[PDB]
Structure 1
Amino acid sequence: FATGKWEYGSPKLERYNGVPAMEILGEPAPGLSSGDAMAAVEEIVKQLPK
């Protein structure tokens, strides 16, 4: 009475403020600044799937 197929799913469903999400952790370029490395990520989010 039962068959099986293979789908795709995640082994670690995170959420931030009651909403699905994905954490991202990196560093700055050796010598720059932790403040600078964030001027970047502010730019990257521009070309992201609205």
Structure 2
Amino acid sequence: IATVSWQMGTEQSVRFNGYPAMELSGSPATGVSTGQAMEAVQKMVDELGS
């Protein structure tokens, strides 16, 4: 009466501002300021879909 089998799944669910969000870290290189890296990450996210 069941289809029990192994699968893959996470053990931690984090939601930010009502939407489910996943965390990501990073650090800029030498010579690049923080705001240039922030707008670079903003453009890299905005190049994706909706």
Whether these two folds match at TM > 0.5 is yes
Once residues 6 and 47 of structure 1 are traced to their aligned partners in structure 2, the CA distance between those partners, rounded to angstroms, is: 36
TM-score, length basis structure 1: 0.71
Deviation, 1:38, is 0.6
- 2:31 matched residue in structure 1: 31
- 1:42 matched residue in structure 2: 42
Please, what is the CA RMSD of the aligned residues?
Answer: 1.9
Instruction: Give aligned pairs, total.
Output: 50
Instruction: Name stretches of at least 5 consecutive residues in structure 1 with no aligned partner.
Output: none
The percent identity for this pair of structures is 46
- 1:14 matched residue in structure 2: 14
